[PDB]
A paper describes a structure:
Evidence from a recent study indicated that NO66 hydroxylates ribosome protein 8 (Rpl8) and controls the biogenesis of the ribosome, which is consistent with the observation that NO66 is a constitutive nucleolar component.
We had already produced two mutant proteins, M1 and M2, lacking dimer interfaces I and II, and they exist as a monomer and a dimer, respectively. Interface II, which was deleted in M2, pulls these two subunits towards the other two subunits to form an NO66 tetramer. This tetramerization may further facilitate the shifting of the subunits when NO66 binds to its substrate. In this context, we proposed that oligomerization of NO66 might affect the motion of each subunit in the catalytic process and thus control the activity.
Residue numbers in the entry:
A (entry chain B): 179 to 525, 529 to 533, 537 to 626
B (entry chain A): 181 to 627
Write the structure that this text describes.
């Protein structure tokens, strides 16, 4: 019997699936199993919270353990604040207790002992298993996948009730914790855009979901959904919560669209460049909130039709590209399979495909062309400034093909350039930067 | 001594609404055209020339002498208040010798061919002031002016197009004007001043004339123009300029981010996630894409942008622009009646029995900002653009219903004791603060 924890099983499996994309689907299919991904997104994602009773306390064995924390605190410069917070919720308040500087096992555990909950901002940096997990999942999210690990001692609550500004996937890892989740309390909170203030017990009402998680379980809920948790009994609780979809709304897309749309409208269409009525302020202003004038209301219309006309002028593509750019510079660097590694520079070449599917994007800025890529990003968010390189027009077509036709191999001498000077400097540059894998080791 | 201008100004002084005075002065300025026809058909559309057959028309406004007495009796200074300019053989060349333009240094440059341009004459001329201060009331946007003096057989400026509606009042001498239709759709009602052009680049003048004292030549932004003196006579024209940056676009530029803001706060569809993989079908790279779900994204966009209108704070922006107009506005020119009835001659011991209305119709805006109410006003502005910071005063919610009344019902007199106000201390306080601040007048001389 090849394997022991379905995590280790499925992880090994991904190393045997050749398409980074396909790997990405898979892992998520696993994450919410038995449930279909397709049914989840269509009806549940952003719609409702979700418990997955796994029945398998060993489901996640290998991802992260109390031990792995204990090592980290010993073997790495874990700093209170920057990497680790000590939290308490008692008598209805939260108290944070971060002794300045360095977070040593001694101190950490002595805080844990005093009822504090331990929260590890960024264990993707230190654990390479978590790193992989995220870096695979983020490719099917089209949005940064981040994660924190929470440890709560017996008979204590770490944090107050609140709603985040992200989609949360709680994975129970060890122990048992009593959760209470709530549906958005009012229209304006449904899919909220800002973390909420710390709420008290009167502030809320009756939960839609109230469960005790056990290792292997998964609990998911959309942003705006309030939630609190606690240890009871005598057992510790460990969980990793995965999070994404921060600032990834149509709204936030529109914000960028519109300013450029109006600029365009103004340069290209003259109606946008005409002068306002001269006496418009005789009927427009808070001061005339209530004018009977029937040109108060024509003005109002003209603003709407003109606003509607902007739909036509909006650089929809140009902004999609710019958001991707941000996802790239936002992304955790790729976890390679063994096959990929070996075929790549990480493991010469001649006129006889893409390293992975989600590591690079081509983006025209200022009549130029830049290929932005992930493969030199830290395992800390934005610790690296964005990384690109300049494509010259001659090679644009080729580069576009390479990205559009993964995972299909292409002969270097079938890359639609002008010359064979081009075809070689493109595959050469790409290959060295770790963007490109060969079918036979060079 | 007695010209049409002198006559219309003495007419304005007998017209009690400040809003009628403005209309009437414009009617005078573009006569014999009716303004009604001008603003519907020709404003922003066509160049317009008024052959007036009257040299005396603008007599009073400004003369060459008035420009001398300026130079010698006020610190007029090169760069800042006065520019010399020359166009010869193809190039403009600018020559502002640092320092204080006195007459010696001025006339020399005039003699050497330069055209003199006076940037801020309404500061020193009190007729130009009245002229602009009245006309801005009916343009609803800043009315600026410069005065251009040009010696014979010369040309001061290269051909350009401006970013403003321009009215040219020919005051002395003669000048050959050439006006040219916007050359391409993107230069029609253009957004910024053009680079100086070379006579090779320009098409066929849509209009060409010699202007004589008393004529008026209007033409919209975008329209290319240039002028030259010929014969042996000089030119002296004032150009009145307006409507800078006062477009439906500029209104929208402001609306939008507030509208998107409100839309997200106030409606869940905007707060929803993009989809997980849209950048598989939406990119510059995937410009040409086949995805079908693409043309769905595209529509979602257009349909949400459509929705955003129905979220736009159109009043609140109007109000902000009002507030900027107020700041840009020249300070008002009082009739002798306004002056006699207001804090310019007699002082605040009034009563519930005093009848009162606002001083003029265009000196104040009431604007709600940060849960507060402020009356912004022009009566303390300078006759120099933006020299003073925005002036205003706070209105407490127990007065706002009065204050709105007062502004709405100019020029109807309202007994003080009939002001919607909860108390009689409140009643008197508004009236008094408003009067002493010089925003109010009484029907009867206070003393
Ligand atoms: Ni939370
Ligand atoms: Ni000009």
């Amino acid at each position: 019997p090849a394997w022991d924890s379905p995590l280790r099983r499925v992880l090994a499996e991904l190393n045997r699936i050749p398409s980074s994309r396909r790997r990405a689907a898979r892992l998520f299919e696993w994450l919410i199993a038995p449930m279909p991904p397709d049914h989840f997104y269509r009806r549940l994602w952003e719609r409702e919270a979700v418990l997955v009773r796994r029945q398998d306390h060993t489901y996640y064995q290998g991802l992260f353990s109390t031990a792995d924390l204990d090592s980290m605190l010993r073997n790495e410069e874990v700093q209170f604040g920057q990497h680790l917070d000590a939290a308490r919720y008692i008598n209805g308040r939260r108290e944070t207790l971060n002794p300045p500087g360095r977070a040593l096992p001694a101190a950490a555990w002595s805080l844990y002992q005093a009822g504090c909950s331990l929260r590890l901002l960024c264990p993707q940096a230190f654990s390479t298993t978590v790193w992989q997990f995220l870096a695979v999942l983020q490719e099917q999210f089209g949005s940064m996948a981040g994660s924190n690990v929470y440890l709560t001692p017996p008979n204590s609550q770490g944090f107050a009730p609140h709603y985040d500004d992200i989609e949360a996937f709680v994975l129970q890892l060890e122990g048992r914790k009593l959760w209470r989740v709530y549906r958005p309390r009012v229209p304006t909170e449904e899919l909220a855009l800002t973390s909420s203030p710390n709420f008290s017990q009167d502030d809320l009402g009756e939960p839609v979901l109230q469960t005790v998680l056990e290792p292997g379980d998964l609990l998911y809920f959309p942003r705006g959904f309030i939630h609190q948790a606690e240890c009871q009994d005598g057992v510790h609780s460990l969980h990793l919560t995965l999070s994404t979809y921060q600032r990834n709304t149509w709204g936030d897309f529109l914000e960028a669209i519109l300013p450029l749309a109006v600029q365009a409208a103004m340069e290209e269409n003259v109606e946008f460049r005409r002068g306002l009525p001269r006496d418009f302020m005789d009927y427009m202003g808070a001061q005339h909130s209530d004018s009977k004038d029937p040109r108060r209301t024509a003005f109002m219309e003209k603003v709407r039709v003109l606003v509607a006309r902007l739909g036509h002028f909006a650089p929809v593509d140009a902004v999609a590209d710019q958001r991707a750019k941000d996802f790239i510079h936002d992304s955790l660097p790729p976890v390679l399979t063994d096959r990929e590694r070996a075929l790549s520079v990480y493991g010469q070449l001649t006129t006889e495909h893409m390293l992975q599917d989600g590591i690079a994007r081509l983006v025209g800025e200022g009549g130029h062309l830049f290929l932005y890529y992930t493969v030199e990003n830290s395992r800390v968010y934005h610790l690296e400034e964005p990384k690109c390189l300049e494509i010259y027009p001659q090679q644009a077509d080729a580069m576009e093909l390479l990205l559009g036709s993964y995972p299909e191999f292409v002969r270097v001498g079938d890359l639609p350039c002008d010359s064979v000077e081009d075809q070689l400097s493109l595959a050469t540059t790409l290959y060295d930067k770790g963007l490109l894998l060969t079918k036979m080791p060079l």
